[PDB]
């Protein structure tokens, strides 16, 4: 019983964290095989005016780097630019490189953040990619380079490297190909996060977990067709429901179908009327159907 936003065990990823320093800048990097990936702003001589990263790279001095894993320092063989990342070839292989892949995450998908400072993991927490391509995370200065990951059958799937925090205090990274999520810029310019919508399918997963845990006071006796709901959602800051195949086992488990839940969502979106649902006083879209099923059943 219970529902917690949890992370997968971080040990496999902790051994891949390095500190990357250049001049006045210090952040974290990801050491896989003989390569270090880190945000390319570590070589910026400003962060207050618009950086020409190509220029900065061209005038760079390889010896001005300081890359370390604990006490182990790494010699830099070469640097190439990889979107918003530097791809740093180092003189040593990381013997603790896990089996890994890269995958870009989509809005609505969950993953794990390993928050790092000075090349060492400080914390680990689960996040969910928002519709405007940000995450509601917790980061202060020095956190850039912090990796996002999912672990699936022993393989570490890397999906995020932290880059910046917007004016609203929400967070933006790039994937491991160096493509920024949401097309935000790694510049100190004035960027505003876009509009953001509740992932309805995630909210459904949450309500199913609420039923499985014996929360039922909010459950509607009315139904509403997906068609009809979708008309309402787009005026009320929620996404349209596309696929309902992912609710088969949960509806089988609970005897409650998607249509009753969509009706409940309409009531609850307005207000929780003074009450709580698994400790929440408003609807969350931080849980996927996958997390819920795995957490309720294994």
């Amino acid at each position: 019983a219970g529902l917690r936003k949890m992370a997968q065990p971080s040990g496999v990823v902790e051994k891949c964290i390095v500190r990357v320093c250049y001049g006045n800048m210090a952040l974290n990097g990801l050491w896989l095989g003989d390569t270090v990936m880190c945000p390319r702003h570590v070589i910026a001589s400003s962060t207050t005016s618009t950086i020409d990263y190509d220029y900065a790279l061209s005038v760079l001095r390889l010896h001005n780097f300081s890359i370390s894993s604990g006490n182990v320092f790494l010699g830099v063989v070469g640097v190439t630019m990889r979107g918003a990342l530097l791809q740093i070839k180092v003189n040593q292989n990381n013997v603790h490189t896990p089996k890994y892949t890269y995958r870009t995450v989509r809005p609505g998908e969950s993953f794990n953040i390993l928050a790092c400072y000075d090349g060492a993991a400080a914390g680990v927490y689960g996040v969910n990619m928002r519709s405007n391509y940000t995450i509601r995370g917790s980061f202060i200065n020095g956190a850039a380079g912090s990796p996002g990951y999912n672990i699936n059958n022993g393989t570490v799937e890397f999906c995020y490297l932290h880059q910046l925090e917007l004016g609203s205090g929400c967070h933006v990274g790039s994937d491991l190909d160096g493509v920024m999520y949401g097309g935000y810029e790694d510049q100190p310019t004035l960027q505003v996060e876009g509009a953001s919508s509740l992932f309805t399918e995630n909210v459904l997963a949450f309500l199913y977990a609420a039923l499985i845990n014996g929360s039922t006071w909010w459950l509607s006796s009315s139904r509403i067709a997906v068609d009809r709901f979708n008309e309402w959602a787009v005026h009320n800051g929620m996404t349209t429901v596309v696929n309902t195949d992912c609710f088969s086992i949960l509806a089988a488990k609970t005897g409650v179908d998607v249509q009753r839940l969509l009706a409940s969502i309409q009531s609850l979106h307005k207000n929780f009327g003074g009450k709580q649902i698994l400790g929440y006083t408003s609807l969350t879209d931080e849980f996927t159907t996958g997390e819920v099923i795995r957490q309720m059943y294994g």
């Binding site: 006045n24 800048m25 210090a26 952040l27 945000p39 702003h41 570590v42 910026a44 962060t47 400072y117 000075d118 980061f139 202060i140 200065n141 020095g142 956190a143 850039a144 380079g145 932290h162 880059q163 910046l164 925090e165 917007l166 004016g167 933006v172 935000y184 810029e185 790694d186 510049q187 100190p188 310019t189 004035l190 960027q191």
Partner: peptide, 8 residues
């Protein structure tokens, strides 16, 4: 304004 989160 966006804050690029490297440290000193």
């Amino acid at each position: 304004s966006a804050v690029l989160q490297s440290g000193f």
